[PDB]
Specification:
This is part of a larger assembly, with four copies of chain A. With about 100 residues, the first copy, chain A, is mainly α. Helix content of chain A is about 75%, strand content about 0%. Chain A: It comes from Severe acute respiratory syndrome coronavirus 2.
């Protein structure tokens, strides 16, 4: 029943896939400019003087900080769902096994 | 000005401090780049109008 | 192209027109040396908690 | 992803340890029921 149905264990695969997607999104956001002349911090520092570079950098900091905060919030919500599942599994172990 | 000239600068080393630190100029206004950092940069070409 | 990291010989099969490679993070992870024209890999220096 | 400051931490219990717990539960049930 299991071996002939590649998607039989989708419930566990879905969890793995969701976590992988969250990390890939967090990384890709580093490519965004967020209004800055460049997403590459080193290029900004190499081309612009301090009083101008700082203006461009603050734009990247705001964007990247917001992206990281979004990631963590989503992880807290997802963690709650997993905890509920684990609590159910623990109950079944005690009462069924 | 209606018939402005253009020259292309290539295959050479550009020490920009010779122009930047010159007192012969009334203005030296740079956009997108800080003039004091030009000596640390490389470009494919430079065009002089 | 400034930065900090460890440089080693690359195993990346660059074509003659390619000067560098990029990752999904929008960073350079390989360059062609301007004098020897060999390809070098770029990795970050070790770190951790 | 480590190069972007992202790290993955190991579980406290290994796959072998989890398998051992499962085996103990099976052996218990088969030989002694629910006692």
């Amino acid at each position: 029943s299991l071996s002939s149905t590649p998607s039989a264990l989708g419930k566990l695969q879905d969890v793995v896939n969701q976590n992988a997607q969250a990390l890939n999104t967090l990384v890709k956001q580093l490519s965004s400019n967020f209004g800055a002349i460049s997403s590459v911090l080193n290029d900004i520092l190499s081309r612009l003087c301090p009083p101008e570079a700082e203006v461009q950098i603050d734009r990247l900091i705001t964007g990247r900080l917001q992206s990281l905060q979004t990631y963590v919030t989503q992880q807290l919500i997802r963690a709650a769902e997993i905890r509920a599942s684990a609590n159910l599994a623990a109950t079944k172990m005690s009462e069924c096994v | 000005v209606y018939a402005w000239n253009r020259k292309r600068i290539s295959n050479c080393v550009a020490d920009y401090s010779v122009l930047y630190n010159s007192a012969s100029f009334s203005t030296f206004k740079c956009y997108g780049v800080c003039p004091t950092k030009l000596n640390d940069l490389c470009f494919t070409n430079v065009y002089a109008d | 192209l400034t930065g900090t990291g460890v440089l080693t010989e690359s195993n990346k099969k660059f074509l003659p027109f390619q000067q560098f490679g990029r990752d999904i993070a929008d960073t350079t992870d390989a360059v062609r040396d301007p004098q020897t024209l060999e390809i070098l890999d770029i990795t970050p220096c070790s770190f951790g908690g | 992803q480590k190069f972007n400051g992202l790290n993955v931490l190991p579980p406290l219990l290994t796959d072998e340890m989890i398998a051992q717990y499962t085996s103990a539960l099976l052996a218990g049930t088969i030989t002694s029921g629910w006692t």
